[PDB]
Amino acid sequence: MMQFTMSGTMLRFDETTLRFSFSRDGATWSGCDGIEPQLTREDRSFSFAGAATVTHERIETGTGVGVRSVFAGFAGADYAFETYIWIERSSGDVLCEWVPLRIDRVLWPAPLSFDRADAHDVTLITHEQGVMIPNSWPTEVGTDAVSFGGRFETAGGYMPWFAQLRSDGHAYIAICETPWNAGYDIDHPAGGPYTHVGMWFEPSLGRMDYRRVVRYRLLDHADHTAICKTYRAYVNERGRLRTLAEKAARNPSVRDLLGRSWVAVGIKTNVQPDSSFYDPAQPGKNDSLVTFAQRERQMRTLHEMGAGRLYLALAGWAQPGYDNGHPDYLPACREAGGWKGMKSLIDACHEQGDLFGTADQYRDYYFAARTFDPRNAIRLADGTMPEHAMWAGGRQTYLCAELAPDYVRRNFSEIATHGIVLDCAYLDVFTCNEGDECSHPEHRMTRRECYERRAECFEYLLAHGILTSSEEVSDWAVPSLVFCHYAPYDFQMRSPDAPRHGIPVPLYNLVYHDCVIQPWMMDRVAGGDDYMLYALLNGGAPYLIRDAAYATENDIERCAVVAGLHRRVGMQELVRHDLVGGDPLVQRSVFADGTAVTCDFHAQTYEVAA
Ligand SMILES: [Zn+2]
Question: Which domains, and CATH codes, for the chain?
Answer without folding.
Answer: 2-237 (2.70.98.10), 247-485 (3.20.20.80)
